[PDB]
Amino acid sequence: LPSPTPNLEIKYTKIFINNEWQNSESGRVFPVYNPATGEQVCEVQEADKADIDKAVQAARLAFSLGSVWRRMDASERGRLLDKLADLVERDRAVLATMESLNGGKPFLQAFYVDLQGVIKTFRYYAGWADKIHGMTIPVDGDYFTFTRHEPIGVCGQIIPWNFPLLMFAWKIAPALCCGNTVVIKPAEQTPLSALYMGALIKEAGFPPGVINILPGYGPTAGAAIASHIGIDKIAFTGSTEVGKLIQEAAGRSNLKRVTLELGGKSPNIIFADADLDYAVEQAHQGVFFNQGQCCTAGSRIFVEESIYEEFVRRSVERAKRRVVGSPFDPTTEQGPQIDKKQYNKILELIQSGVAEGAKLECGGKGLGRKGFFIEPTVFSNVTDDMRIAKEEIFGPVQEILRFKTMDEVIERANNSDFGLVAAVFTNDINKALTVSSAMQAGTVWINCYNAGEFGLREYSEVKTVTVKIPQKNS
Amino acid sequence: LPSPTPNLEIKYTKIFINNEWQNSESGRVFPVYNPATGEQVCEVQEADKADIDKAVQAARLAFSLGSVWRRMDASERGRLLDKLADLVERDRAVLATMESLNGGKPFLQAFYVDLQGVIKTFRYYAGWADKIHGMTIPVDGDYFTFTRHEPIGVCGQIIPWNFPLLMFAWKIAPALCCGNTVVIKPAEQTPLSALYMGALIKEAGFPPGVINILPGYGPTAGAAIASHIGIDKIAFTGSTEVGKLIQEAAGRSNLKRVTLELGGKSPNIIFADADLDYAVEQAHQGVFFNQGQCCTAGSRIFVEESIYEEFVRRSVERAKRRVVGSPFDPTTEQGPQIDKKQYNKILELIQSGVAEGAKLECGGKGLGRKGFFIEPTVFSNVTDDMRIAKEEIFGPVQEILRFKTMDEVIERANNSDFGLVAAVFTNDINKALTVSSAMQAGTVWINCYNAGEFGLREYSEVKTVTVKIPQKNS
Amino acid sequence: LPSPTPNLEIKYTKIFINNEWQNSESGRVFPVYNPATGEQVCEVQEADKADIDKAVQAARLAFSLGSVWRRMDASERGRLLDKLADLVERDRAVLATMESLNGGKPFLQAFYVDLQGVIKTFRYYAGWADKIHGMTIPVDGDYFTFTRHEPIGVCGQIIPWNFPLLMFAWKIAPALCCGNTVVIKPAEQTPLSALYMGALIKEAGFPPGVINILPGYGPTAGAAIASHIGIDKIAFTGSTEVGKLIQEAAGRSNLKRVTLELGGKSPNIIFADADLDYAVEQAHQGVFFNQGQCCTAGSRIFVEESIYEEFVRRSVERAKRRVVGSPFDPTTEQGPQIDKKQYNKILELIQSGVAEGAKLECGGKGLGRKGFFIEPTVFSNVTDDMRIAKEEIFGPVQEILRFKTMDEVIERANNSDFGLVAAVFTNDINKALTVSSAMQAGTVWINCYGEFGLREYSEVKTVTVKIPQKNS
Amino acid sequence: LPSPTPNLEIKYTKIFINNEWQNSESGRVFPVYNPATGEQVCEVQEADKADIDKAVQAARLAFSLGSVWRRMDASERGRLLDKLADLVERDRAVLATMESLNGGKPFLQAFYVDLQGVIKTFRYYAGWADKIHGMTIPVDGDYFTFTRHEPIGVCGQIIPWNFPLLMFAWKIAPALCCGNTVVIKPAEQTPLSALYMGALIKEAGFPPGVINILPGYGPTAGAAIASHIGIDKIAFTGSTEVGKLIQEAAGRSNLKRVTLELGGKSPNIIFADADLDYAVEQAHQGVFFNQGQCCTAGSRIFVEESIYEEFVRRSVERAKRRVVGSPFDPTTEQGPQIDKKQYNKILELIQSGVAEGAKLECGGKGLGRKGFFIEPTVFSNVTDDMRIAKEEIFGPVQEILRFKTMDEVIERANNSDFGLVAAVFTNDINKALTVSSAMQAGTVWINCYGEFGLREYSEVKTVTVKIPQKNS
């Protein structure tokens, strides 16, 4: 068992541009709080349009033809990525601590889950860097045609606050493995580990201007990036509200390519032939992981009538024994919520559903006086048209619905806006096959949930060369 | 030898939805004209926001789960693409006539290039519908993970007038071969070729609603497809301004996937080593093929100062010799411009040149009254400053710019700020190597020009499926 | 329903070189029989080493650099293969009739599975011909490396007699797809289907010498190409024995590329949660389809202890009811065995098993004379030690073994020295999971009975260009 | 500049089986010489059939189903491969020195060329291990088909002495990356860099049995491998003579998969338009690198007539100023050849071409009295008839030919039996284009001298699941 970093000093708090730590152009600065105690952890250089323009200029310069980063061998990009999964490794405890501190998630999970995933990621695109292959194509006539992949250029990426450092690797690592330069805004709530990565980037020795980290707010720094004239790709993750704005601010900007990963509903189909103890434990980790603040995990759980009663009973025993406490105490399964705005929105929703005929089985009220702690709450007899069902609840709220027929539960889970991931627990292989093909989802988990190379195409563009040849042959 | 269809009737002028020819929901029609004779050729059922909805409902029910088009073997998706290639090949004389009248391209050229592209396209992608493979990924843990490539769904497509039937085949075939359903709006200028395809689609026996043709205007039918909420992806070719509009129309409603084929300059660098007989020719056909209406060809021609006067000589000779005249005269090389508004913006830009310093060496005015015929024109002594070299001309104008060194050209050619294509004519291998990698082009052509798999990647969606397995074993 | 061709003149009997029908350099011919009647159906030119030469030279000049078939667009090669499927779709009845009379499969099966397969193979491979893609690779330094997939060249193919026409198509589509050239020799038992193809191959119009059909014998002509100095690859399918000689015959001759398709056991595993209606029949059509003679199925059946006797019950009920007769009878499910040597080696083994403690549940002997018809037999209570469960039975013999636990049924299946396909029947997703991994099986079919054939007909060419300065 | 390890103690002289160092079962021993001086460096435990059967049981066991190496995550096999390049990097100077001493490579050459490549190779497949992907295939009907690539199993690998370590890296990394186990036999000349790698392989912590290293001889250890019954795939590299033997010694023995990396002819083609100062040197380094001892020593240099004289004039000056010396002296470009057999094989071939009309412009005899050094030789006026031009040299002899036209030289150059590799030196892009295609080569370089290494250590397992109703 590892131990949290004692008396942690937030060394790194300035803006990261051209591998220099720089003050804000205004001098302005904003505070970062501790969701467990509501206290303030420190203050960091806010970034605005002026501050963004700096970072863009740096990242364009580091992308120019004669540049170190541009001239490097692909395998030497994979080396640098691999050196940073080394530095992440030796500092695993501090990056897991500063996650625990900034982000309220239990320090043991932040170590064995989050940081773990940051390192494997970096290692994995480390290996991809020099295995990104174009093709050669037979073309009617005396021609030879072939295809290079090449970096797109300056990418600005905006990440939410659910998984601050994991989002960070998830986005840096493909971007760099393809040879791009980067301008990343971590959420305003959780910039801290992001900034610590900046020193680790200098330390593994990426060329300057290749990774630039600007902490600050959606309206200021975020909107700066989303509309900047000198950024080629923007990749954003968060609320479908703010997502809409990015896409329009990008066709009225420079037509920059745009990636949007937005939340979705995550239905959770449990047929009766499943191991009830397994499923009650998986569906409880599938809703209660990272205190429900999991953009990859959901809350709509469809239990088959046969096992509906017993399931609820099992799940409510799980929540009632589910330790909520200080993130740094190693027996805590569930930390606070990220901030008060989130805390309120979930309560307002719990009391919403309690006022539409949902049987509150437990929870449904805050925990402490200080912090943002919410009792793990379970709801029963949720109908499709309850508000609580139509809108995903980004906290520790388990909503158990009922179903009796397979095609029923399929059309129900199916109906949905854009965005949807599905999870089924069955042993009938025919049941798994029909359902997983029928779900209009992009990810489907047969008997599990979790938090690759398709991520690479979306950081490169295809250049096509065709040469005329004297006499074509087989 | 092949001769235009005589007494050609325009049998197909209604709206194509659900494999029924249909009238406007408003009763209204719109004119279509013969750019050669200026004469109105017929009148077509104009489409608007409600016609669009008709075809979106068609195209959403035919993509539904039980659907014939969904159950179909992917191998049979390709059989229909081959049966349609059959029909096109059968009616290759009628199609090339229709394209030549309503579009203005010479008939022989519509028969031996355009139409040859159409048929080759459908046979190509008939071969792909079988071969769209997903992948199996090894993952850490006791898990089995694979991907499926599944159709995106209802695809609104908006093609222009440059190559009416070709652009129709280049957009429709990849989306079909991936299992999609289409709402395609052909140019208001040139919709007769695409309406006649509906009749061949019915005869090949696509399930109704799997393709729907809606002729109309950009502002009515164009934007109607762009904002319509039951269209999962939109694919547009044409003006850079219209496309920025679409990207906003698409963020504001539905957040659809959006694809913008948008024009640009196409620098031609003809280094001195080249074979001048070939280069004067390949650079003359690159400019005047399809009378200048080419978003897959260019107007800037860069010649090394060594061979400048000899080049502008041989160029003006070929442009003096170049044969204008009716599309059906089998001696015509260049036909008319598509309609008056273009014909006028081309002469506008010719007079722009003469009043800024261009050495007009040939042509520069209209030919007569009949139709929209413009003389073949060659400019000279052009700089990058001039407004004829900073904005592209969509007509039969050949401008020729000077250069001296090679790193000189590589800079001047990249200066669009946006995405283009390049061409290079060299016997030296390292020039060819150097310039082709130095270009910011989507495609480079070495010792040629021209008017695959990678169009396919944009017409399906990846689904992932991780199964929990009872033990991992290599 | 479709009907066999009434007047089946076997027009095509000569050897095929350079798209010319030719006679034996020796003049010698050989017989071709009808296993339904034991009657003799015609006499076909017998091929030997001197016929294999000329044939190898045909293909050699058809593949030489400045050639039509070489300079061709790959897409045209696609068009050619695609035209072939047309003619086979046209003469479907003809070629199902000729396949039924000569090889003895029921003509309805010939028309609806074999010919189904052939036509689809040529179409699938018409579609590959022009999508065979190479590779640009990032390489340290100022360089630029790419890859071309290029044909191998002259390819000797040696196909068996189980699915004569299908096997002919499975072996020729990919090779010609990649732009190879073929000297194929079909089983002496069944040259007839293949010599017809030669007509259509010309009618569609492949360049002369791009395909070359060779009728004759394994030792006479099969070794002629197996050891032939001017052949680049050899493509054998047959017994585990005859291939070992091919593999050695190569190492001593040319260092040809050698692929060997060799028959192996197909164990079925029917756990007791399986649909017994489906299982007893799907494992009855895996054992008895094509009169047992299957290089894509097998005879060992492992049924769970709980569902054991009820299985073999429903199975003997299916094998008694299984109609046997003339292949042209729209009722016949099983036709004859391929020849008398085959006939005997079957009955020899069915007498082997009765003599070893295997309850002969059904069948066991012949049917009548003038033809090679064996009763559908069923064995129960077959151990692993019995010589009929150790050795392949190439006939209508369904032996059923017992098993009590899953790790037990998985240990018995894998026990086989060479290749193997396995077929599982279970609704337990996790049982399916473990069995299909644990099998050391090439193919695994859960609840039933492409490109990786393309990569065998091409070699890789790699070109690195030195460049002036490298940039992303 | 780095400095060779001083007074290197060859510490690792024993067989490597099961991550334990063992003596030979017979207890026999063989010696290892220094090709620069001819003095024996040390002795090594000789491996034979007895030893190979320990090796093959240890690796078959490492491959068993519940083994560490099999339940390991793919990405972990890549982690292991990454520690091994780490350790090679840590020991770059001892491995380079072992190589310089055992194999006679100039020490800086081992250090910046060979060891660079060992390390990069291990790093590169270290990234491949968990990116080895299968397929999901659309299939006619209510079905779901997909592909998983899986290790073949125990692979016995045999390597030459040209590039002892480099050939070890290149052979083992792709094998390991796919999750196999190995039985590798270094050349008897040059086991030493290999046997050290056993210590490194134990260090990084590969499970036992996954890598067993047997030093000894072709007829004993190597033959005991190719024929073994417990080996699933034989991977040989060297003379096409022993090559042929191993393909036959693997027909007569479990029909195991064979891979043969045998020498071949490597023509150079210098067109007049090229940069003569580049071309003369890249052609010089193409011949004399590693003392002519390349897998395909680029022996034939066709030079277009217009530059022919001036090319050979500058060539002879380059060969005359080439420093043949002690491998440990940092000014050395050319070392000794591997042993006397190779040595006088070369002297006899030089005496051949002199006796047939080739104008020996420099070189032709040995160097000192001790060791196996040979003057860098260069021949003029060589013709395709001469034996030295028809048969491959494995040493420092450059043979320069004339040519007139492009199609002449193209026709001349791919006039090889089997293998060929080609290099063109030209600025004419069309010439480069036509030559590189019309070359019957497998690798073609323009203006100079991976995953196509993976599929070969996997096999595709196919699974087809029946589904209730397929939608797209």
XYZ file of N, CA and C in Angstrom, chain A residues 63-67 69-77 129-142 144 146-151 178-179 426-430 432 446-447 471-474, chain C residues 63-67 69-77 129-142 144 146-151 178-179 426-430 432-433 446-447 470-472:
294
model
N 6.172 23.849 -34.510
C 5.708 23.017 -35.616
C 6.321 23.406 -36.962
N 7.184 24.411 -37.011
C 7.650 24.876 -38.307
C 8.659 23.892 -38.887
N 8.817 23.939 -40.218
C 9.558 22.895 -40.928
C 10.940 22.649 -40.328
N 11.738 23.689 -40.183
C 13.069 23.412 -39.685
C 13.142 22.967 -38.247
N 11.998 22.823 -37.566
C 11.965 22.643 -36.118
C 12.496 21.282 -35.701
N 11.124 19.369 -33.444
C 9.988 18.463 -33.409
C 9.620 17.990 -34.802
N 9.775 18.852 -35.810
C 9.382 18.433 -37.151
C 10.416 17.525 -37.793
N 11.685 17.708 -37.446
C 12.768 16.979 -38.084
C 13.035 15.637 -37.426
N 12.684 15.497 -36.146
C 12.828 14.286 -35.335
C 12.391 13.017 -36.050
N 12.930 11.885 -35.668
C 12.410 10.619 -36.166
C 11.138 10.251 -35.406
N 10.172 9.637 -36.098
C 8.974 9.166 -35.396
C 9.350 8.407 -34.127
N 10.283 7.457 -34.226
C 10.645 6.679 -33.048
C 11.192 7.541 -31.915
N 11.738 8.715 -32.231
C 12.232 9.599 -31.195
C 11.105 10.420 -30.567
N 9.973 10.545 -31.242
C 8.796 11.013 -30.530
C 8.284 9.937 -29.570
N 4.157 5.693 -32.228
C 4.697 6.881 -32.898
C 5.262 6.581 -34.277
N 5.980 5.466 -34.426
C 6.711 5.147 -35.650
C 6.113 3.952 -36.412
N 4.837 3.654 -36.166
C 4.093 2.569 -36.798
C 2.794 3.099 -37.398
N 2.823 4.333 -37.882
C 1.676 4.999 -38.488
C 1.879 4.975 -40.002
N 1.153 4.096 -40.683
C 1.508 3.677 -42.026
C 0.510 4.196 -43.044
N 1.007 4.844 -44.107
C 0.190 5.068 -45.284
C 0.212 3.848 -46.202
N -0.606 3.887 -47.252
C -0.702 2.762 -48.180
C -0.228 3.139 -49.582
N 0.013 2.117 -50.402
C 0.279 2.328 -51.822
C -0.788 1.607 -52.634
N -1.317 2.291 -53.641
C -2.597 1.951 -54.251
C -2.369 1.615 -55.720
N -2.922 0.522 -56.240
C -2.910 0.334 -57.701
C -3.913 1.282 -58.343
N -3.484 1.950 -59.402
C -4.300 2.943 -60.075
C -4.295 2.631 -61.559
N -5.481 2.632 -62.173
C -5.571 2.364 -63.598
C -4.633 3.303 -64.331
N -3.876 2.756 -65.275
C -2.915 3.548 -66.017
C -1.509 3.461 -65.449
N -0.615 4.210 -66.100
C 0.806 4.213 -65.762
C 1.077 5.227 -64.660
N 1.725 5.623 -60.201
C 1.997 5.061 -58.886
C 1.428 6.040 -57.869
N 0.439 6.809 -53.704
C 0.673 6.410 -52.331
C 0.297 7.550 -51.401
N 0.404 7.260 -50.113
C -0.261 8.014 -49.071
C 0.676 8.139 -47.888
N 0.925 9.362 -47.459
C 1.613 9.614 -46.204
C 0.599 10.134 -45.195
N 0.743 9.747 -43.938
C 0.083 10.478 -42.872
C 1.035 11.565 -42.398
N 0.486 12.702 -41.975
C 1.305 13.811 -41.497
C 0.539 14.554 -40.425
N 1.228 15.134 -39.441
C 0.514 15.872 -38.393
C -0.292 17.021 -38.978
N 1.415 11.471 -33.164
C 1.308 11.765 -34.588
C 2.210 12.916 -35.049
N 2.788 13.682 -34.126
C 3.733 14.708 -34.469
C 3.200 16.119 -34.402
N -25.431 -10.979 -19.173
C -26.219 -12.160 -19.448
C -25.256 -13.314 -19.648
N -25.781 -14.517 -19.488
C -25.047 -15.691 -19.917
C -25.593 -16.287 -21.200
N -26.883 -16.110 -21.503
C -27.392 -16.522 -22.809
C -26.613 -15.788 -23.888
N -25.840 -16.540 -24.680
C -25.052 -15.901 -25.721
C -25.972 -15.331 -26.788
N -27.109 -15.974 -27.055
C -28.030 -15.378 -28.012
C -28.536 -14.036 -27.514
N -26.870 -11.903 -25.504
C -25.794 -10.926 -25.681
C -25.663 -10.491 -27.144
N -20.056 -6.574 -22.701
C -20.738 -7.816 -22.352
C -20.141 -8.319 -21.049
N -20.931 -8.246 -19.986
C -20.570 -8.719 -18.652
C -19.392 -7.935 -18.054
N 6.141 2.561 -67.800
C 5.360 1.395 -68.227
C 4.969 0.561 -67.012
N 3.678 0.568 -66.680
C 3.178 -0.079 -65.471
C 3.228 -1.600 -65.598
N 3.539 -2.276 -64.487
C 3.635 -3.733 -64.451
C 3.054 -4.266 -63.148
N 2.820 -5.573 -63.125
C 2.372 -6.239 -61.909
C 3.496 -6.307 -60.865
N 3.382 -14.689 -67.992
C 3.729 -13.885 -66.833
C 4.983 -13.033 -67.032
N 5.781 -13.294 -68.072
C 6.993 -12.524 -68.338
C 6.689 -11.030 -68.463
N 7.670 -10.191 -68.111
C 7.449 -8.771 -67.819
C 6.605 -8.016 -68.840
N 7.122 -7.761 -70.028
C 6.238 -7.200 -71.030
C 5.175 -8.205 -71.439
N 4.051 -8.249 -70.718
C 2.960 -9.152 -71.049
C 1.648 -8.417 -70.884
N -1.219 -9.816 -69.406
C -1.653 -10.094 -68.040
C -0.846 -9.338 -66.996
N 0.359 -8.894 -67.342
C 1.191 -8.118 -66.431
C 0.870 -6.630 -66.525
N 1.032 -6.062 -67.722
C 0.774 -4.649 -67.958
C -0.672 -4.275 -67.678
N -1.540 -5.269 -67.560
C -2.949 -5.049 -67.284
C -3.150 -4.207 -66.030
N -4.221 -3.419 -66.033
C -4.671 -2.824 -64.789
C -5.169 -3.930 -63.877
N -4.920 -3.794 -62.576
C -5.486 -4.777 -61.661
C -6.998 -4.777 -61.753
N -7.587 -3.617 -62.052
C -9.034 -3.535 -62.124
C -9.584 -4.383 -63.259
N -8.866 -4.440 -64.391
C -9.248 -5.325 -65.489
C -9.183 -6.784 -65.065
N -8.077 -7.202 -64.432
C -8.056 -8.523 -63.808
C -9.318 -8.737 -62.992
N -9.234 -7.762 -56.499
C -8.132 -7.665 -57.456
C -7.458 -6.301 -57.452
N -8.183 -5.265 -57.092
C -7.783 -3.907 -57.373
C -7.651 -3.113 -56.076
N -7.886 -3.766 -54.923
C -7.697 -3.211 -53.584
C -6.589 -3.928 -52.799
N -5.552 -4.430 -53.466
C -4.443 -5.074 -52.765
C -3.388 -4.002 -52.515
N -3.264 -3.564 -51.269
C -2.555 -2.331 -50.960
C -1.225 -2.606 -50.271
N -0.207 -1.824 -50.644
C 1.045 -1.765 -49.912
C 1.056 -0.788 -48.743
N 2.192 -0.136 -48.531
C 2.508 0.401 -47.214
C 3.622 1.426 -47.334
N 3.382 2.658 -46.909
C 4.485 3.574 -46.632
C 4.818 3.498 -45.145
N 6.110 3.444 -44.826
C 6.587 3.233 -43.465
C 7.466 4.420 -43.056
N 7.292 4.993 -41.865
C 8.327 5.902 -41.333
C 9.596 5.128 -40.983
N 10.738 5.706 -41.322
C 12.035 5.054 -41.202
C 13.024 6.083 -40.682
N 13.827 5.710 -39.690
C 14.785 6.682 -39.170
C 15.695 7.179 -40.297
N 15.968 8.469 -40.302
C 16.872 9.030 -41.285
C 16.146 9.722 -42.419
N 16.942 10.201 -43.372
C 16.407 10.943 -44.514
C 16.094 9.946 -45.628
N 12.635 7.222 -47.304
C 11.211 7.100 -47.589
C 11.014 5.695 -48.130
N 8.524 2.439 -49.039
C 7.200 1.915 -49.286
C 7.259 0.488 -49.815
N 6.071 -0.081 -49.919
C 5.865 -1.498 -50.113
C 4.922 -1.673 -51.292
N 5.218 -2.647 -52.147
C 4.298 -3.095 -53.182
C 4.018 -4.577 -52.984
N 2.746 -4.954 -53.091
C 2.364 -6.355 -53.175
C 2.329 -6.761 -54.643
N 3.188 -7.697 -55.023
C 3.373 -8.120 -56.393
C 3.176 -9.626 -56.505
N 2.647 -10.099 -57.630
C 2.373 -11.530 -57.770
C 3.644 -12.352 -57.603
N -4.333 -11.631 -57.410
C -3.023 -11.019 -57.265
C -2.193 -11.005 -58.551
N -2.718 -11.478 -59.690
C -2.001 -11.438 -60.943
C -0.968 -12.520 -61.133
N -23.409 -24.352 -27.667
C -23.761 -24.026 -26.296
C -24.469 -22.686 -26.296
N -25.368 -22.509 -25.337
C -25.878 -21.180 -25.064
C -25.074 -20.469 -23.989
N -24.330 -21.210 -23.169
C -23.454 -20.603 -22.178
C -22.392 -19.768 -22.879
N -22.483 -18.440 -22.743
C -21.530 -17.568 -23.422
C -20.124 -17.889 -22.956
N -19.970 -18.154 -21.657
C -18.652 -18.376 -21.075
C -18.085 -19.742 -21.447
N -18.839 -21.300 -24.390
C -18.361 -20.956 -25.719
C -17.011 -20.263 -25.631
N -16.920 -19.213 -24.808
C -15.680 -18.450 -24.674
C -14.481 -19.369 -24.461
N -19.173 -21.619 -33.499
C -20.102 -21.658 -32.380
C -21.515 -21.678 -32.949
N -22.257 -22.740 -32.633
C -23.676 -22.899 -32.985
C -23.908 -22.911 -34.502
N 14.342 15.411 -44.070
C 13.106 14.772 -43.618
C 12.260 15.730 -42.781
N 10.946 15.694 -43.014
C 9.982 16.501 -42.277
C 8.679 15.735 -42.123
N 8.038 15.916 -40.972
C 6.785 15.234 -40.643
C 5.685 15.379 -41.720
